């Protein structure tokens, strides 16, 4: 029932839940932007992220598992299901400016979620979490 979590090389993070399986990446590429993509302020807004119930379910589980407050925390983003470029959701985890408080909350949630969270978001640096579908790695449990 509980989604499976995996860390390979102490830097590559994965999550699997039923038919859904994601790689979790952290870097300075802002793939999604509120000007172009779907703004997520309520769990139900995620119906626009995918046609797949399993991809929606796993995304909501992950966000709940890291302690995201759907109404009071900053909204996050996903690519509209009508686009063909691929399923993706993006959370701003930048430890800077107005986002610092939320970035610390996210870091805590990740440390509780993952056994050894290898935190790559540097203090004062733009750092965005992107979750994308991937085949469950062969070396994972």
């Amino acid at each position, epitope marked *: 029932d509980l989604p499976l979590l995996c860390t390979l090389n102490k830097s590559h993070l994965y999550i699997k839940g039923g038919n859904a399986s994601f*790689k979790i*990446s*952290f*870097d*300075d*590429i*802002a*793939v999604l*932007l509120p000007e*172009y993509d779907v703004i997520i302020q309520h769990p139900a807004d995620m119906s626009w992220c995918s046609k797949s119930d399993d991809q929606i379910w796993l995304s909501q589980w992950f966000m709940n598992a890291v302690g995201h407050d759907w109404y009071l925390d900053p909204p996050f983003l996903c690519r509209n299901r009508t*686009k*063909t*470029e*691929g399923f*993706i959701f993006q959370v701003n985890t*930048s430890k*800077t400016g107005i986002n610092e408080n939320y970035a610390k909350k996210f870091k805590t949630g990740m440390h509780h979620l993952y056994r050894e969270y290898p935190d790559s978001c540097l203090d*004062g*640096k*733009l*750092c965005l979490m*992107k979750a*994308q579908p991937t085949s469950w790695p062969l070396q994972c449990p």
Partner: antibody
Amino acid sequence: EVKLQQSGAELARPGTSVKLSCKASGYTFTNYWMQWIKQRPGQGLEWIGAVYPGDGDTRFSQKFKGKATLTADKSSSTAYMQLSSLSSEDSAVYFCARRRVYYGSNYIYALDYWGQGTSVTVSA
Amino acid sequence: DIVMTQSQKFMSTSIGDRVSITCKASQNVGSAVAWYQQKPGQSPKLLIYSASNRYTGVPDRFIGSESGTDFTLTISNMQSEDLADYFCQQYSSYPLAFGAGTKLELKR
């Protein structure tokens, strides 16, 4: 080998339109956004916009909205840029370049390959 | 939109000298900055990506570095073939933005 081949020099009258092409070879066309960049004589590079060939999604620089129309044909691995209502300010060299669709941290997201450029000259 | 403010449009240099070209991003872009070299009538060539990584076949003398929103391209020892235009670019997010460019010329 990766190659981006652009169409030849354009000569056009003021107020007309031209459609520039950039044919991609040696890679998966649908794994990249095709970028377009303008370079006016003796000046710098100015990013115009990009097109995703999967569904034709676009990104533009605010200045070029209403000037440039970006399309792509997946079957011919070709991206197109139509420049409308041509004026003297449109006379320039236009380059296409590729940028990978995002898929984790371990790819280069800068413009690694570029076309040879296409010259557009506007005159009556 | 993020804007890249490049240093001087023209720089006078001598062969064998250390040259520094700078670029300032209007907001934090992490390390998502590239440097391109262009010679007249040729396409730009990618030199540096991720602010400090040399692209394929780029010689050791091209050194990219970063400090917050300040990015620097250093040519440790300028060779005759390095006289060209240089452009910084941010690629963290659309719209992509280029610096205005810097042309290295020879002092005499």
